[PDB]
Amino acid sequence: QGSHFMANKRCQLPDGSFRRQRKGYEEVHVPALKPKPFGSEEQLLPVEKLPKYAQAGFEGFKTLNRIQSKLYRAALETDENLLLCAPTGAGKTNVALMCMLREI
């Protein structure tokens, strides 16, 4: 049962989570997560203040999404390899796209 093995035997609940007891079936009520608190001078990137050359193909985007803007400098400026750790909804495709504009 690989990828369903769950080699970890004990799990950790999120912040506002609890267990609700129903008639023979259980529910886990799990609160949602909050984005990181805004740091000073912590600014996302526009597609203008990223590479002027790779500004091609960027039709349909105005300013870089938070994770792509947090990763783009290193993602493009050198052949330094990347390992991204994030959950769905960020556009990790857009970080790999900067890493590929590096090769571009």
């Binding site: 990181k36 608190p37 805004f38 996302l44 300013t63």
Partner: protein
């Protein structure tokens, strides 16, 4: 009209807000009395008394102070657009040029902010909590005299569409989610220029008000549902949403303080037993569990409105 408390104020009052500082707040927190000159800001001190420290420092009248971030208050005034958090920070935009923001309104996220010449903006608060400004800021042909964002249903953060006023004596309806921004969704003709366009539920019913006291209710959907009308003193239709008795309704004023509301889904347009008015909106506290901050002729008031299933008091 019942008295929780009433007081006078000097000078020229032009607006007033009532804000919280978190969704948990059982009481509204920050009453922002917007003079024509500055803003007397107070968190209710049980004898409500003056407050500078609020983090508001209003040096101009108010056009919004709003809880849209849970810990955040956005305060936009004729000078600038201040983003405020539990850290009562001022991450501020400043209205392009020396021009000044005129007509604005609040969502759960978005902030309608409308400047002279028809230059609108579009906000939306980032994954983060701090807000992002949609790159375009659209021109409008005529004077947008009012527009209200539809307060978004729980699980989402955005409207389905929104209405827009214009001075040509009609009304525009514009959607603002990435579905269509800067597309005129649907309009309707008005027998006079708009003055106030606020929304009601219980389904979604629009209320239009003209500058001469007349108002109209409608069904709210991608196109106008149906205009039902009444004539209420040739004076500005002041329109407001405020809860009552387990449900929300509209306050309106042209020459009376009219509660227009759904009595078990029943549109009644009931006067309230008080002389002419200046400005009002909802309020809560211990001294006033549910009432109206009604700032009136040279006067400011915390009022209570008793039995609302009846016709004659």
């Amino acid at each position: 009209v019942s008295e929780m408390a009433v007081s006078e104020l000097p000078g020229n009052p032009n607006a007033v807000w009532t804000v919280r500082r978190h969704i948990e707040d059982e009481f509204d927190a920050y009453i922002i009395v917007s003079f024509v000159n500055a803003t007397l800001v107070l968190s209710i001190g049980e004898t409500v008394e003056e407050v500078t420290d609020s983090g508001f420092l209003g040096t101009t009248p108010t056009l919004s102070c709003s809880l849209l971030g849970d810990d955040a208050l956005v305060q936009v005034y004729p000078d600038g657009i201040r983003h405020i958090r539990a850290d009562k920070r001022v991450n501020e935009w400043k209205t392009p040029g020396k021009k000044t923001i005129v007509k604005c309104a609040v969502n759960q996220r978005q902030v309608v902010i409308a400047l002279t010449g028809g230059e609108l903006v579009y906000f939306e608060m980032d994954p983060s909590g701090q807000l992002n400004e949609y790159t375009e800021r659209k021109e409008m042909s005529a004077d947008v005299v009012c527009m209200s964002l539809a307060n978004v249903p729980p699980g989402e953060q955005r409207s389905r569409f929104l209405a827009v006023g214009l001075v040509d004596n009609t009304v525009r309806i514009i959607s603002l989610d990435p579905s269509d921004c800067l597309q005129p969704l649907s309009m309707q003709a008005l027998p006079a220029q708009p003055e106030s366009l606020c929304i009601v539920e219980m389904f979604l019913y629009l209320n239009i008000g003209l500058q001469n006291g007349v108002l109209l209710r409608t069904v709210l959907d991608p196109v106008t549902g149906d205009l039902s009308d009444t004539r209420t003193g040739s004076r500005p239709v002041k329109l407001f949403r405020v809860r009552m008795q387990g449900q929300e309704a509209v306050l309106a004023m042209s020459s009376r303080s009219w509660l227009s509301y759904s009595y078990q889904s029943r549109f009644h347009l009931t006067p309230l037993s008080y002389e002419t008015l200046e400005f009002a909106s909802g309020f809560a506290s211990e001294q006033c569990p549910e009432g109206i901050v009604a700032i009136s002729t040279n006067t400011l008031r915390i009022l209570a409105l008793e039995k609302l299933g009846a016709v004659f008091n």
